[PDB]
Enzyme design. Structure first.
Site, mmCIF file in Angstrom:
data_model
loop_
_atom_site.group_PDB
_atom_site.id
_atom_site.type_symbol
_atom_site.label_atom_id
_atom_site.label_comp_id
_atom_site.label_asym_id
_atom_site.label_seq_id
_atom_site.Cartn_x
_atom_site.Cartn_y
_atom_site.Cartn_z
ATOM 1 N N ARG A 6 -0.918 -7.373 3.842
ATOM 2 C CA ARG A 6 -1.051 -6.100 3.674
ATOM 3 C C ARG A 6 -0.649 -5.657 1.986
ATOM 4 N NH1 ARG A 6 -0.480 -0.958 5.394
ATOM 5 N NH2 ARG A 6 1.422 -0.570 6.343
ATOM 6 N N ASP A 25 6.553 -3.072 8.138
ATOM 7 C CA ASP A 25 7.293 -2.709 6.773
ATOM 8 C C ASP A 25 8.682 -3.464 6.791
ATOM 9 O OD1 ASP A 25 5.009 -1.277 6.097
ATOM 10 O OD2 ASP A 25 6.180 0.778 6.811
ATOM 11 N N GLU A 30 2.837 8.354 -2.597
ATOM 12 C CA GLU A 30 2.229 7.053 -3.351
ATOM 13 C C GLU A 30 1.270 7.601 -3.897
ATOM 14 O OE1 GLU A 30 1.061 5.655 0.364
ATOM 15 O OE2 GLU A 30 2.477 3.750 0.486
ATOM 16 N N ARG A 85 -0.774 10.664 -2.278
ATOM 17 C CA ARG A 85 -0.798 10.774 -0.738
ATOM 18 C C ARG A 85 0.310 11.947 -0.796
ATOM 19 N NH1 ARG A 85 1.650 6.322 3.336
ATOM 20 N NH2 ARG A 85 2.060 7.464 5.052
ATOM 21 N N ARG A 99 -6.498 6.019 10.716
ATOM 22 C CA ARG A 99 -6.647 5.460 9.223
ATOM 23 C C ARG A 99 -8.393 4.855 9.772
ATOM 24 N NH1 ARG A 99 -0.650 3.379 7.135
ATOM 25 N NH2 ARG A 99 -0.403 5.224 6.293
ATOM 26 N N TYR A 124 -4.973 0.993 3.593
ATOM 27 C CA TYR A 124 -4.776 0.770 1.982
ATOM 28 C C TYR A 124 -5.899 0.053 1.578
ATOM 29 C CZ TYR A 124 0.097 2.408 2.570
ATOM 30 O OH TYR A 124 1.150 3.233 2.725
#
Ligand code: DAN
Length: 679
Positions: A213, A238, A515, A531, A593, A633
Site C-alpha cells: 500500500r 494501517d 495529507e 485531502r 474510493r 492512493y
C-alpha cells in the site's frame, strides 16, 4: 460423462438481458450433470449492470429460483460463484473483490477467468488474469449433479423462474468446460493471457510481504525512476501492525524494475508471506506488539543528486490512533535528546536520554551509563550488542497468536521487549543515498521539533519538493499533518537535508487527515493541494518559500468523499496547450474510493501579485476505468520520455469489504496525447 472438453463456444455476442442458450450443444446433457470439473472463459463486459453471470447451469422453473450454479462478475471488478439447491440443502459461495477490470486506456478489454471444482480434493478455486484469487474447502463436496431439476445451460445470465437474472452484456470470447479438474499451474497460465499494466512489488518477491500500500514514484535528474511502498505483512491494516518500507528502481524508463530492497525495516517480528483471513471476524484482527514504518516520501536534491526516503516510525504496538501526546524528546543543557525508559522503572518514568555519540545518560545524575545505541538505534551494554527473541504470528481459528521464536535479533529501543524503551508517540525517520539506493545512511530521526502538545505528527505520503527558482531556490520541503496546534504542516531544509525546520500551516486542532502534495509555480511560489475531512480537496499558497500559507480554498470542480483519499499532484516539465501545467490523480466518486481520474491543470497568471498571482484551470480529466472500479492512493511521475507514470492502488482501500487483497498496486503509463483526450 466423457473425460475432457464437454463443451466449447467462441465469439458469442450477448445483448444485455438476453442471455444465450447452450441447451442444444452436443454436450449439454453432460454439463447438466457434472460431478466436478473446470470452466475457463474469456469475456469483455460492456454493461454497467451490478451483477453479471458469465456462465450458469440450473433449474429455470417456478419456485426453483435458488437451484443453480453460476460464475459471475460485478461492475466493481469483483468475481465469484454461487452453487445452490435452496439454502436448506446447500449454498456454497466464493468471491474476491477487485479481480477484473472493464476498461484500459479508453477501451473495453477482455479478462480471462476460471473456476476449478476439484472433487478429489474437495476444493473450489477461482482464478483471473494470471492470479489465484480465492479458495473454498468443503467436507461435503457438491457440484452440478447435486442440483435438483437442472434444465438449462446459459451464457450471460442465470435463469430464475423463466427470467434472465444477473444480466450480462458484452462478448464471451471463448468458453471451455472440462469434466476434469485442471492443475493450478495450467489455470494460472491460461488466465494469465490477459494482463494490463505491471507490478513493481508483488506477493512472492524478496520483500516476503503478501500485501502493499501507499505508493511513491519519482524520476531522478539522471533519468532513473525510483519507487517505494509500504510492505504490509499482516494484511492491509494501517499501523499497529508489522510493516516495512520497500524500494525498487528502473533504469529503462519504467519498463523493468530491480529486485526490491527494504531500506526502512524492523526485525522484532519476522517478515513472512501470510494469507490474512477475509471472513467477517478475522479480517478485523491486526498484529499487536510489532514496531513498524509506514507512509513513504521520496525526494531528490538536484544540486547534490542525493535522494532521501522519509517514513513514519511507529514504536512497538503503536499507530497514529493510539500514539501518546508528546514529542518523545527531553531538553537538557538547551539541547533536545531522545528520551528512554528503563524497563524496571515506573510506567511513565523516562529518566534517561540518548546524547552525543549514542551514549545513554542518566538524567538524574547527569552521568553516562554503561549503555549506548549505534546508528540503527540498537542497544549495546559495555560495547556488547544486546539481543532479544523475534516474534512469529499465526492464526488459531479467529485468534492471532504472537509468540516468541528462538531467533535472536538486535535489541532496538523501539521494540516491546527492549530493556530501554522509547516514548510511545510516532517519530519521523529518514535515510539518504548518494548512489540511487545501492546503500543508505544511518537512521536519522528528524522529529525533535514535534510539538509537546501533539498526539501525532506524520508525513503526507508521495514525494517532496525542492524549490527551483527565486530567493529560496534550493530549499527542500516535505508535507506533514497532525493532531495538535495545527493540522497541515511542513518541514524544510536550507542546507541540503542536513537540518530540518518545522512550520505550522494553520491553527486547526481537529487532527483531520490533511495529507498533501506540493507543486511549484513559475516564479518559485508554491501551491499545496490536500485531502480534508470535508467534501472537497483544499488549496493553500505560499509566497515565502513555505514559511507562511494562505487559508484553505476548495478545489472547485473535482469531486471527492467526506473522509477523503490521498492525492498526487506534480509539475510537468513541458508546457501543455502552451502553458505551465500540473497533473493531479485521485478517485472521483463521492462515496467509495473508485472512478480514478488524472487531471491536467493549466497555470494562468491572473495579472495580480502575491497569493492571487496564479490561477489553475483544470481543463482535462482522464478516466482510468469504469465508474465503479476501485482506485485509492496514487503517485504520478514524469518519465524520461514524455510519458506520465502512475503507481496506484486498484481497489477500495477504505472499504471494510476489500481488505487484505494481494497484487492490487499497479503501474501504468500514459502520454499527454492520451490524457488530453487527443487519442
Ligand atoms: C500513519 C497512518 O496511520 N496512515 C494512514 C492514514 C490514517 O490512518 C488517517 O487517520 C486517515 O484515515 O489513512 C490511510 C487511508 O487509507 O485512509 C492510509 C495511511 O497509511
Amino acid at each position: 460423462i466423457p473425460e475432457g472438453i464437454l463443451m466449447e463456444k467462441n465469439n458469442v455476442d450477448i445483448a444485455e438481458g438476453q442471455g444465450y442458450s447452450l441447451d442444444q450443444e452436443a454436450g449439454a446433457k453432460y454439463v447438466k450433470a457434472m460431478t466436478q470439473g473446470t470452466i475457463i472463459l474469456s469475456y469483455k463486459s460492456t454493461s454497467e449492470n451490478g451483477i453479471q453471470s458469465l456462465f450458469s447451469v440450473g433449474n429455470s422453473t417456478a419456485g426453483n429460483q435458488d437451484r443453480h450454479f453460476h460464475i459471475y462478475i460485478t461492475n466493481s471488478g469483483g468475481i465469484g460463484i454461487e452453487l445452490r439447491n435452496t439454502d436448506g440443502v446447500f449454498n456454497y459461495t466464493l468471491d474476491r473483490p477487485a479481480s477484473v477490470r472493464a476498461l484500459y486506456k479508453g477501451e473495453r478489454v477482455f479478462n480471462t477467468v476460471a473456476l476449478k471444482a476439484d472433487a478429489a480434493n474437495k476444493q473450489c478455486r477461482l482464478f483471473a488474469n494470471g492470479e489465484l484469487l480465492a479458495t473454498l474447502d468443503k467436507d461435503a463436496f457438491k457440484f452440478i449433479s447435486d442440483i435438483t431439476g437442472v434444465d438449462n445451460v446459459t451464457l450471460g445470465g442465470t435463469k430464475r423462474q423463466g427470467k434472465i437474472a444477473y444480466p450480462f452484456g458484452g462478448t464471451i470470447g471463448d468458453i471451455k468446460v472440462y469434466s476434469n479438474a485442471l492443475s493450478d499451474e495450467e489455470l494460472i497460465q491460461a488466465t494469465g493471457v490477459t494482463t494490463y499494466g505491471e507490478n513493481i512489488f508483488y506477493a512472492g518477491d524478496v520483500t516476503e510481504s503478501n500485501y502493499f500500500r501507499i505508493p511513491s514514484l519519482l524520476t531522478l535528474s539522471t533519468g532513473t525512476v525510483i519507487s517505494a511502498a509500504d510492505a504490509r505483512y499482516g494484511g492491509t491494516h494501517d499501523s499497529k501492525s508489522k510493516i516495512n518500507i520497500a524500494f525498487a528502481k528502473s533504469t529503462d524508463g519504467g519498463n523493468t524494475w530491480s529486485e526490491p530492497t527494504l531500506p526502512l525495516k524492523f526485525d522484532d517480528y519476522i517478515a513472512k508471506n501470510i494469507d490474512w483471513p477475509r471472513d467477517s471476524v478475522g479480517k478485523n484482527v491486526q498484529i499487536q506488539g510489532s514496531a513498524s514504518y509506514i507512509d513513504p516520501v521520496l525526494l531528490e536534491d538536484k544540486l547534490t543528486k542525493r535522494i532521501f526516503l522519509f517514513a513514519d516510525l511507529m514504536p512497538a504496538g503503536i499507530g497514529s490512533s493510539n500514539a501518546s501526546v508528546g514529542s518523545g524528546f527531553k531538553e537538557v543543557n538547551g539541547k533536545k535528546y531522545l528520551k528512554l525508559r528503563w524497563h524496571k522503572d515506573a510506567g511513565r518514568a523516562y529518566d534517561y536520554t540518548i546524547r552525543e555519540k549514542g551514549v545513554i545518560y542518566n538524567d538524574a545524575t547527569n552521568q553516562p551509563t554503561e549503555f549506548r545505541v549505534d546508528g540503527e538505534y540498537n542497544l549495546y551494554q559495555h560495547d556488547t550488542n544486546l539481543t532479544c527473541k523475534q516474534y512469529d504470528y499465526n492464526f488459531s481459528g479467529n485468534n492471532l497468536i504472537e509468540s516468541k521464536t528462538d531467533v535472536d535479533v538486535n535489541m532496538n529501543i523501539f521494540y516491546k521487549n527492549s530493556v530501554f524503551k522509547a516514548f510511545p508517540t510516532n517519530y519521523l525517520a529518514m535515510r539518504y543515498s548518494d548512489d540511487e539506493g545501492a546503500s543508505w545512511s544511518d537512521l536519522d530521526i528528524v522529529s525533535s521539533f514535534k510539538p509537546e502538545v501533539s498526539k501525532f505528527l506524520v508525513v503526507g505520503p508521495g514525494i517532496g519538493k525542492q524549490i527551483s527558482t527565486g530567493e529560496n531556490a534550493g530549499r527542500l520541503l516535505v508535507p506533514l499533518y497532525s493532531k495538535s496546534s495545527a493540522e497541515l504542516g511542513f518541514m524544510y531544509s536550507d542546507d541540503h537535508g542536513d537540518n530540518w525546520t518545522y512550520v505550522e500551516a494553520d491553527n486547526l486542532t481537529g487532527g483531520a487527515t490533511a495529507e498533501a502534495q506540493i507543486v511549484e509555480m513559475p516564479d518559485g511560489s508554491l501551491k499545496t493541494y490536500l485531502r480534508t475531512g470535508s467534501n472537497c480537496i483544499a488549496e493553500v499558497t505560499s509566497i515565502d518559500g513555505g514559511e507562511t500559507w494562505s487559508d484553505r480554498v476548495p478545489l472547485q470542480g473535482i469531486s471527492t468523499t467526506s473522509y477523503g483519499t490521498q492525492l498526487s499532484v506534480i509539475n510537468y516539465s513541458q508546457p501543455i496547450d502552451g502553458k505551465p501545467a500540473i497533473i493531479l490523480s485521485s478517485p472521483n466518486a463521492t462515496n467509495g474510493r473508485k472512478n480514478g481520474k488524472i487531471w491536467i491543470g493549466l497555470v494562468n497568471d491572473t495579472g495580480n501579485t502575491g497569493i492571487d498571482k496564479y490561477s489553475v484551470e483544470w481543463k482535462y480529466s482522464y478516466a482510468v476505468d469504469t465508474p465503479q472500479m476501485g482506485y485509492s492512493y496514487s503517485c504520478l511521475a514524469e518519465l524520461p520520455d514524455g510519458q506520465v507514470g502512475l503507481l496506484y492502488e486498484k481497489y477500495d482501500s477504505w472499504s471494510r469489504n476489500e481488505l487484505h487483497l494481494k497484487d492490487i498496486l499497479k503501474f501504468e503509463k500514459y502520454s499527454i496525447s492520451e490524457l488530453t483526450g487527443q487519442a
